[PDB]
């Protein structure tokens, strides 16, 4: 059935996906490559509230798009499923995190790529830890995060697993070599000195926005992609869309002027897709209460959907050209 490719004849899910339960067997069998996983978890957020509503609000925007992307000659129909939201208590983060852990492990047991939508930036700690444990100490993982904040607090308010500690915890992962870690977009003053000092002590080779502009952007991004994907067995890719200029991403926890514009992030996605694979896609810190006509949520959506599309294009998982309507 291919009517969905063409102009019409005449459960809120990611991309109008089928629900599959969060079971390794069900997911193995469902035929999709990606499993969307909502994580409306909020309690590592040190700044303004609202990211709890992001997984719902992200889902809605994705429903408006057709599944066929003419630019890549790819159809996304059935390439993803939605496993719903991870079930989590409030006012109990330890348990919350262990539930996120188990969820992500399950999806990776299935051989499907989890697409994780937060919620606050700290969910990536657990998610990344999942991937680490999932591939084992015999294998090498790589990590790339886009964002304006380094999130290299060794602790924050005496605590170890908050959003601004994300990257500090992630780079302690046994099988992630600091050489396979990339962080792109850091700028402005939500970046205290101890985050710089810890970055320097560990050899985190972050690509500040200023570095990026000086390099005409794409060349530096290319070198960072190379370090993350070269000689690694699995790659985690995360987004904080405050990497983007405020104008294109107002609706985020902590917006930041002077960042990437939409077409640049779209160039970047194609450059990532050339490497022909990702193990985990995350996005966090969308914040619909602060959005202007869904600008930010729609940007996030196009980014995640173009990446899926671009990967499929690089796989040669395209549509037969010689197919016409009714």
């Amino acid at each position: 059935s291919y009517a969905h490719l063409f102009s019409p004849l005449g459960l809120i899910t990611f991309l109008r996906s089928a629900h599959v339960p969060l079971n390794a067997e069900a997911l193995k069998a469902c035929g999709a490559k990606y499993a969307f996983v909502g994580v409306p978890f909020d309690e590592g957020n040190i700044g303004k509230p609202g990211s709890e509503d992001a997984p719902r609000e992200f889902r809605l925007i994705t429903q408006e798009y057709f599944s066929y992307w003419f630019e890549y000659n790819v159809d996304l129909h059935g390439k993803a499923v939605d496993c719903g939201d991870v079930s989590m208590p409030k006012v109990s983060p330890e348990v919350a995190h262990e539930r996120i852990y188990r969820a992500v492990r399950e999806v990776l047991k299935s051989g499907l790529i989890p697409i994780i939508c937060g919620g606050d930036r700290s969910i990536s700690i657990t998610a990344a830890r999942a991937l680490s444990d999932h591939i084992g100490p015999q294998k090498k993982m790589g990590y790339m995060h886009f964002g304006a904040q380094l999130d290299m607090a060794d602790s924050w308010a005496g605590e170890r697993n908050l959003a601004p500690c994300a990257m500090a915890r992630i780079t302690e992962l046994p099988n992630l070599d600091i050489r396979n870690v990339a962080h792109l977009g850091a700028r402005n003053a939500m970046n205290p000195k101890d985050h710089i000092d810890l970055s320097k002590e560990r050899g985190l080779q972050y690509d500040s926005m200023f570095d990026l502009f000086d390099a005409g952007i794409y060349p530096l991004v290319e070198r960072s992609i190379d370090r993350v994907w070269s000689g690694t067995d699995a790659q985690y890719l995360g987004f904080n869309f405050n990497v983007m200029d405020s104008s294109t991403a107002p609706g985020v926890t902590s917006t930041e002027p002077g960042g990437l514009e939409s077409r640049e992030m779209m160039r970047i996605v194609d450059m990532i897709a050339k490497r022909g694979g990702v193990s985990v896609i995350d996005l966090t810190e969308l914040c619909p209460i602060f959005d202007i006509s869904g600008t930010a949520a729609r940007l996030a959506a196009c980014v995640i959907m173009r990446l899926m599309a671009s990967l499929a294009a690089q796989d040669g998982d395209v549509i037969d050209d010689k197919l016409r309507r009714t």
């Binding site: 060794d154 926005m209 107002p250």
Partner: protein, 347 residues
């Protein structure tokens, strides 16, 4: 005297560390979620009085001039300062891009707001002039956050007086030319900043400049003022053709040449509507985000005695983008200024 609490909160879980304000908070979350009683940048409060300023050794005074009733368009700018101050809680006073603690480098203080006399442009502007005068005379450079674009009239007068027999430059960055000789007979509305500056005895055409104009809310007389007085205008067209940097450095050279002081007024409508919807009269075909930050970096390399930022209206903005853009205009100006001073071996 110059004292503040790192991460604001006093009481049982007060922090005392002298550098705690440039590090991740230790005992609690500071102001990052809940504003509390935040001053600009968490700076000590200091009355706009020349003795107190001088006694604190303050080198930068933040002073809000919320007056928005000198305006031919529409009120709202009076709410700007409050959103600015709130947005600073979302930032540290440390800037890794320049490796500078803005707060301790400048001993910045928050001088509160200039009082207004509603319906009385003349008296409110005299208040502003008096208030700025106390900051200059206390030995400090000044950040003025508007408020209406009437703000450079009392601002440039304060700096002109203080400059004395010296010479003063005046740079005006804006979507609009703001050179009404008068507006319906009124000399001192928000669209006469540049002619009023030219009237000052020690501010001369050759040290004046405008940048950022485009589109059609510029009556011909505002253009004609620049033509007749031979004042360098760099349109938004020329900025885009030749490069922000090239144009910027050129006009900063022009307004600083053989001057003792510089007055730099920056209207937020110079910024593209996509980046700054919360505005008194917002316009497309303006500066992008990265460009705003670059122009502020450039202005900081050069230095000014008074920076004024105006016409920010948070009422017309659903998000934090306007207030945070305006924080960045200031913070990048100060960071760049500190970096430049440190390399020169100076303050």
């Amino acid at each position: 005297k110059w004292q503040f609490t790192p991460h604001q909160h006093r009481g049982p879980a007060e922090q005392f560390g002298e550098n705690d304000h440039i590090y991740s908070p230790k005992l609690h979350n500071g102001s990052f979620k809940s504003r509390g009683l935040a001053t600009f940048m968490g700076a000590p409060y200091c009355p706009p009085d020349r003795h107190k300023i001088r006694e604190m050794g303050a080198k930068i005074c933040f002073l809000a001039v919320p007056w928005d009733q000198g305006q031919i368009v529409r009120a709202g700018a009076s709410q700007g300062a409050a959103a600015l101050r709130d947005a600073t809680t979302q930032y540290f006073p440390y800037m890794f891009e320049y490796d500078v603690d803005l707060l301790s480098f400048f001993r910045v203080v928050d001088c509160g707001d200039v009082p207004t006399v509603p319906g009385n442009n003349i008296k409110s502007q005299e208040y502003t002039a008096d208030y700025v005068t106390e900051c200059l005379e206390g030995g400090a450079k000044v950040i003025l956050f508007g408020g209406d674009h009437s703000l450079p009239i009392p601002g440039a007068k304060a700096l002109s007086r203080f400059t004395g027999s010296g010479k003063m430059g005046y740079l005006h960055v804006d979507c609009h030319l703001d050179a009404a000789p008068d507006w319906a007979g009124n000399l001192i509305t928000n669209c006469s900043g540049a002619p009023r500056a030219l009237d000052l005895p020690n501010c001369n055409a050759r040290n004046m400049a405008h940048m950022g104009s485009r589109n059609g809310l510029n009556p011909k007389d505002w253009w004609d003022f620049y033509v007749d007085n031979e004042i360098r205008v760099v349109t938004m067209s020329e900025m885009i053709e030749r490069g922000l940097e090239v144009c910027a450095n050129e006009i900063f050279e022009r307004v600083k040449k053989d001057t003792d002081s510089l007055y730099f007024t920056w209207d937020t409508d110079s910024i593209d509507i996509s980046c700054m919807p919360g505005n008194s009269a917002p316009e497309c075909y303006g500066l992008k985000g990265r460009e705003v930050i670059q122009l502020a970096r450039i202005a900081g390399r050069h230095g000014c005695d008074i920076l004024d930022i105006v016409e920010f209206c948070p009422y017309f903005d659903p998000s934090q983008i306007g207030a945070k853009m305006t924080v960045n205009m200031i913070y990048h100006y100060l960071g760049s200024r500190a970096q430049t001073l440190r390399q020169q071996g100076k303050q």
